[PDB]
Design an enzyme around this catalytic site. Structure first.
Site, PDB file in Angstrom:
ATOM      1  N   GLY B  76       0.598  -1.293   0.084  1.00  0.00           N
ATOM      2  CA  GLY B  76      -0.113  -0.184  -0.140  1.00  0.00           C
ATOM      3  C   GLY B  76       0.861   1.295  -0.056  1.00  0.00           C
ATOM      4  O   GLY B  76       0.379   2.506   0.143  1.00  0.00           O
ATOM      5  N   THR B 106       3.818  -1.062   7.007  1.00  0.00           N
ATOM      6  CA  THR B 106       3.623   0.588   7.051  1.00  0.00           C
ATOM      7  C   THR B 106       2.073   0.799   7.060  1.00  0.00           C
ATOM      8  O   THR B 106       1.719   1.725   7.798  1.00  0.00           O
ATOM      9  CB  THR B 106       4.164   0.929   5.746  1.00  0.00           C
ATOM     10  OG1 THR B 106       5.346   0.343   5.177  1.00  0.00           O
ATOM     11  CG2 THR B 106       4.263   2.362   5.715  1.00  0.00           C
ATOM     12  N   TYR B 137       4.155  -0.319  12.062  1.00  0.00           N
ATOM     13  CA  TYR B 137       5.467   0.795  12.050  1.00  0.00           C
ATOM     14  C   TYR B 137       5.004   2.143  12.917  1.00  0.00           C
ATOM     15  O   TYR B 137       6.083   2.581  13.571  1.00  0.00           O
ATOM     16  CB  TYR B 137       5.450   1.486  10.700  1.00  0.00           C
ATOM     17  CG  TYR B 137       6.157   0.529   9.455  1.00  0.00           C
ATOM     18  CD1 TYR B 137       6.715   1.058   8.462  1.00  0.00           C
ATOM     19  CD2 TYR B 137       6.648  -0.908   9.702  1.00  0.00           C
ATOM     20  CE1 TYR B 137       7.452   0.158   7.322  1.00  0.00           C
ATOM     21  CE2 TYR B 137       7.089  -1.394   8.822  1.00  0.00           C
ATOM     22  CZ  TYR B 137       7.530  -1.091   7.494  1.00  0.00           C
ATOM     23  OH  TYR B 137       8.281  -1.667   6.433  1.00  0.00           O
ATOM     24  N   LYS B 162       5.082  -4.851  17.476  1.00  0.00           N
ATOM     25  CA  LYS B 162       5.878  -4.376  16.473  1.00  0.00           C
ATOM     26  C   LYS B 162       6.071  -3.055  16.186  1.00  0.00           C
ATOM     27  O   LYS B 162       5.227  -2.093  17.096  1.00  0.00           O
ATOM     28  CB  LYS B 162       5.168  -4.937  15.449  1.00  0.00           C
ATOM     29  CG  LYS B 162       6.209  -5.104  13.892  1.00  0.00           C
ATOM     30  CD  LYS B 162       5.913  -3.957  13.101  1.00  0.00           C
ATOM     31  CE  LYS B 162       6.938  -4.062  11.901  1.00  0.00           C
ATOM     32  NZ  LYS B 162       6.677  -4.620  10.707  1.00  0.00           N
ATOM     33  N   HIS B 230      15.370  -7.342   9.380  1.00  0.00           N
ATOM     34  CA  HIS B 230      15.816  -6.878   8.037  1.00  0.00           C
ATOM     35  C   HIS B 230      17.128  -6.328   8.256  1.00  0.00           C
ATOM     36  O   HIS B 230      17.611  -5.248   7.537  1.00  0.00           O
ATOM     37  CB  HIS B 230      14.902  -5.854   7.529  1.00  0.00           C
ATOM     38  CG  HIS B 230      13.429  -6.134   7.216  1.00  0.00           C
ATOM     39  ND1 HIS B 230      12.599  -6.405   8.307  1.00  0.00           N
ATOM     40  CD2 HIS B 230      12.733  -6.200   6.042  1.00  0.00           C
ATOM     41  CE1 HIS B 230      11.531  -6.813   7.772  1.00  0.00           C
ATOM     42  NE2 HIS B 230      11.446  -6.956   6.483  1.00  0.00           N
ATOM     43  N   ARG B 233      19.679  -5.661   5.374  1.00  0.00           N
ATOM     44  CA  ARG B 233      19.172  -4.658   4.393  1.00  0.00           C
ATOM     45  C   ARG B 233      20.281  -3.699   3.766  1.00  0.00           C
ATOM     46  O   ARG B 233      19.991  -3.392   2.739  1.00  0.00           O
ATOM     47  CB  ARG B 233      18.082  -3.772   4.646  1.00  0.00           C
ATOM     48  CG  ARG B 233      18.101  -2.760   5.925  1.00  0.00           C
ATOM     49  CD  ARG B 233      17.025  -1.898   6.361  1.00  0.00           C
ATOM     50  NE  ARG B 233      16.291  -1.288   5.114  1.00  0.00           N
ATOM     51  CZ  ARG B 233      15.152  -1.988   4.667  1.00  0.00           C
ATOM     52  NH1 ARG B 233      14.650  -2.847   5.240  1.00  0.00           N
ATOM     53  NH2 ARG B 233      14.618  -1.211   3.586  1.00  0.00           N
ATOM     54  N   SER B 289       6.173  -6.584   0.396  1.00  0.00           N
ATOM     55  CA  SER B 289       6.875  -5.822  -0.590  1.00  0.00           C
ATOM     56  C   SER B 289       6.341  -4.606  -0.507  1.00  0.00           C
ATOM     57  O   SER B 289       6.578  -3.887   0.420  1.00  0.00           O
ATOM     58  CB  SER B 289       6.332  -6.720  -1.915  1.00  0.00           C
ATOM     59  OG  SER B 289       7.030  -5.970  -3.050  1.00  0.00           O
TER      60      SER B 289
END
Lengths: 377, 374, 377, 374
Positions: B76, B106, B137, B162, B230, B233, B289
């Site tokens: 999104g 997000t 987030y 989270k 991550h 990353r 993603s």
């Protein structure tokens, strides 16, 4: 040798089974807290480290389901001193109760839904199975998540809602706040796979079940979701209770009250009125309320009086405390001793006095005394 | 005869059992979704109605526990069109996932915890083990009940909270709000018998783990509760994650990222750095993603093939390590008592059969049990 | 010598006691603010440093309980200038009032429950006993903790709730918000050991007590908890008031209003109607409302007129201001001069004019003038 | 004859009275739950119906004031099973407790102030003196009325607020939220005639009292309001508590902790450090953990026995010191006017009889007055 104790194999053999349906001298093999076999003459070697216990000459039946217990305590109607203590594990098991539904009563100022929930979970970890009703006498309902619909839907142990009507300690709800309340418990039940029932605390008002009939007129909650309790607290309310059950509802009698209609006399009058036992439950109203805190004995004492002074079969007297309750509250794996279900069984004597009690495979009562107890008993 | 099929007895025999610790050719007796026996050569008649299955020449290990999945969907970040769909049961069971931890990313405006909770419960009914992290987030966290501590405490499927830091898609959280959040997750966990962890989505900021260190100063939440993800990353950040893991903390590497630090390359560098595998887990961030779960099994394979990890050590970051971090009692390890979450593999590690709580999920490498609407 | 002054021993002797029940020339020994002995001829040496005071030829009776006083002030109905000041300690004591219940009126925008509470406590520390009613004319009730049930349960000095009906200054409540309101005060009362009463401010609407009867129809709050006030403000409302008392309710007449039914005439008509004095209270509506701020004199003036122009006995005229009030509000240790109770007594003359006043053992009025006052009088 | 039993006259004569300051063989006349006379050799007929009691050879001191008790229960730090039960009246009166201050601990999700308030009031009806602290380890505090200042101000039984710092079970509070909290407790107290204190649960963080010092900088709350507890939980922290007590502050030692600094060892080291006993109190943290109240009387005994404190000085941290810190008017000291909260002990300090506000609670060392459902 290879170790199979993880399975916790147990062979209850020799007893006269009542599941509650009258079976004969049947056997019950448990494994991992679940009943995995019910048939006469099961070989003792059939499975590895099987703890075989001879119940020869004994009666084996399903554990009691008590859908009206003040787990965290209750009372308080005569001042903060009258606030009763929390229910002890052993107090329940020794009464035969393996499954219990907790609710709150008059006091919802010093008693909270989050407290009932935590306790409901203490009992679960301690070995039995516990559930709870959100809300209390007061309407609208003081809840956990902000809405009755949400509690019954998203809080796992909540299976419905409680309330009081036709009582001088009510919150004076109108058909509107009462109907909306029952509708949310219904919807939320659907969403969370719960009974989504509404349990009414019956008082002594002359109007009796009137608020309920008005509700049925003001919405479309099935009559099988409304449950009036303490129906035997006064004759005309019990009379109406019978009429209610006739139209499809399931009534709930409380063993803790002896007059003007006794528990046994209540379940008996119901049959005499042509109500299927399936729509008749018996609860204890345990730990609520000398001033004295109510107990759980009157339950077994009802089964006994039903078989000893009325002609009910052992199988029938058990129903309103087993198969009937599990059925009304859609308690999967409960009230029935068939393969698949949970190992919640009681060992008794032909005189119907408890000797042993099994909850999910563990032994809660070894000699009529609890060998398992609450962490601080 | 008498009926004993209620116990659903199943015997997995003659397979090279990795639990994950390399045992030999061991047998595993399952009953009522539980592993009731683990000792080489068990009788095919030891228990009555026993579905005996010949796994000779095959590998048998614990199913994967994936702790980073946008179960109800995610994305999104580029309009409503980029909102990914919900996760399919078969998708998980085919990638060898038997236990999963859902979460939100997000988007926390068109994605709510009540939905995730619902999807988590739907998954458990369908056959697998699912839990969820509250929040997203965003900090402070959008919860179900009003506070993180209360969510972790009383919502049965929440095991922690989270959030997102050192990222350009955060809520620009300050040390106090951050610390408080973790403290609530920690306290909640104790009250609910949950690990009460705080998973931090790591971004590409230069600051990297500085907020996680800043937090350690302002509160007393054990470092064994702060899980950054991550970490692979960007190299500068990965390097720090390693230093963080060297201090007793655990690090999560996402198998959905292949550069600058590939998954295997990640689990590998950690060992070289001298980090007990116990403090290293591998997550997929599936349906994010649109991310998939193939990369989980691929990270194991490549670890045993390309790099020189053993089958047993390769599995750890995807089982026991994960299980030991979230305290997922009875999972990630094959022992009597634990859950019958199993994976039948070929010698070349290609999932053939999958078992979840006793029930058979994948038959010929293709799920034979699916979600209600697949 | 040993020091016994801590006990604060005091011997009221020689007076013609009315407790309020007609006793004769009896004596009253006080110790630690409490009555510890009531009997004729108590020896003056019976206890150590006993302050013996000869009330020979005097009348000794229980202190007044005023259950309708605007402690923090009231009015405001004709603009902010009409906002009356706070009640002064001495203004009450000099009127015989030793116990008082505070409430709010029309104005609940510039008057707050937390202000009434603080004041209620100022008076307590200053020597008398004060309580308060949560809420005001406006319904739903603007409260302290957020719910009427919670205030009446957890705020110690709150003993019930106030409201207005059939008045052009009402909040226009419906039977629903009115019944719910009375139910919460009832439940909360039970939980906190308070009367949990609902006090209705009667207006001049033709409907009179109708809202109340409707409430009784819409819930199960006992009729003994509802208290209509200012009943003597218009004849047909007073007529209905009598009918109400007949069905079990306790009515409250206000001395501050003289027409069209005087206080004395009201208490008298009640008796003539066959209402037990126990269900008849007289309040002052003090400090509410030239524009003039109401006072507390009309109270004693009622007792006087009752004995002087109607034939009530001194004992009877006292009841609606003493034993009756304490009884309706379950004010323990009040309204009665018996061992155990508090030393709230008034010394008068046979002409029924106050001379001395005792509150919890201290002397508030030494010569018809206060020897104890509010911190800023 | 005339009836005077309404006054419930009772005369405790011929006992070695410690109030706590060692007087001699003094007599104590009680009336209406109040001590109306204290002067050696009082007439057994001075007042009418007087229950005269011979305490010859026995010790008579003020009952204990325990300011740290989870009255409605506590615990829960390991699941709902670890939620301790509520406190029994007899349990308190038998440990010699006549005045107690209830409070909540870590769990403030299944434990609410309304319940504590209720339990506190129930206790007062039953015979003893009870008060309570609002809030819990959590900051900002979950109150009854909406704000700490309002709770302390208008809720009749709240005397101050509680919280938790330098602990791994806190809410990770920052200096501002902390300071504000204390300021509200202080202001509230003035408006309610309450001590308006702020009790800090001390954890095992290296920071120790640093937050309490940090608070002193950012506000003006008198140091005589900040009370840290469990200071004897770790030596490094205890040392600081002593320094804090040397600055005019008071410290609370919990008799439920026996290492690294035992209770007695704690009260002892303070004296050696040169701290007036006035700034030292002893609490039990009963029903916490399941903690009991035996350790209160045991800390006195051991203080007079093992260490070299006198009966009078040993009692102080459990009476007058406590009374003077919470401004509990009329308690912790035997004088005319004060409450008849008394303890009849043997010369070896073994509670025989207990009196609470005149009424007799313990007869033969066993309570003869109990809670409604014991």
């Amino acid at each position: 040798m290879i170790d199979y104790t993880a399975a916790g194999f147990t062979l209850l053999q020799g007893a006269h089974l009542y599941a509650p349906e009258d079976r004969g001298i049947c056997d019950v093999l448990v494994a991992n807290g679940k009943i995995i076999a019910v048939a006469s003459n099961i070989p003792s070697d059939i499975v590895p480290n099987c703890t075989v216990v001879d119940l020869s000459g004994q009666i084996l039946c399903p554990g009691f389901i008590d859908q009206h217990v003040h787990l965290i305590g209750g009372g308080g109607e005569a001042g903060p001193t009258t606030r009763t203590p929390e229910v002890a594990l052993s107090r329940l098991t020794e009464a035969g109760v393996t499954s219990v539904v907790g609710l709150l009563g008059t006091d919802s100022i010093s008693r909270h839904p989050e407290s009932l929930l935590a306790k409901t979970r203490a009992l679960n970890e301690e070995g039995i199975s516990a559930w709870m009703l959100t809300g209390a006498y007061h309407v609208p309902s003081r809840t956990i998540t902000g809405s009755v619909e949400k509690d019954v839907a998203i809080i796992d142990r909540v299976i419905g809602v409680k309330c009081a009507i036709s009582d001088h300690r009510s919150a004076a709800p109108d058909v509107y706040h009462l109907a909306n309340m029952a509708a949310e418990s219904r919807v939320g039940g659907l969403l969370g796979g719960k009974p989504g029932v509404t349990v009414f605390h019956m008082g002594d008002s002359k109007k009796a079940l009137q608020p309920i009939y008005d509700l049925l007129e003001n919405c479309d909650v099935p009559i099988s979701k409304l449950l009036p309790t303490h129906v035997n607290r006064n004759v005309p309310l019990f009379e109406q209770a019978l009429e209610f059950a006739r139209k499809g509802g399931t009534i709930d009698i409380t063993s803790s009250i002896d007059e003007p209609v006794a528990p046994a006399e209540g379940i008996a009058r119901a049959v005499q009125a042509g109500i299927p036992l399936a729509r008749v439950t018996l609860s204890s109203d345990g730990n609520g309320s000398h001033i004295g805190v109510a107990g759980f004995e009157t339950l077994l004492e009802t089964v006994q009086v039903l078989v000893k002074d009325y002609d009910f079969s052992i199988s029938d007297a058990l129903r309103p405390l087993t198969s009937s309750v599990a059925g009304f509250l859609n308690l999967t794996g409960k009230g029935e001793i068939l393969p698949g279900n949970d190992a919640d069984l009681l060992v008794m004597t032909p005189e119907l006095r408890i000797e042993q009690v099994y909850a999910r495979g563990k032994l809660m009562v070894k000699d009529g005394k609890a060998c398992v107890k609450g962490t601080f008993e």
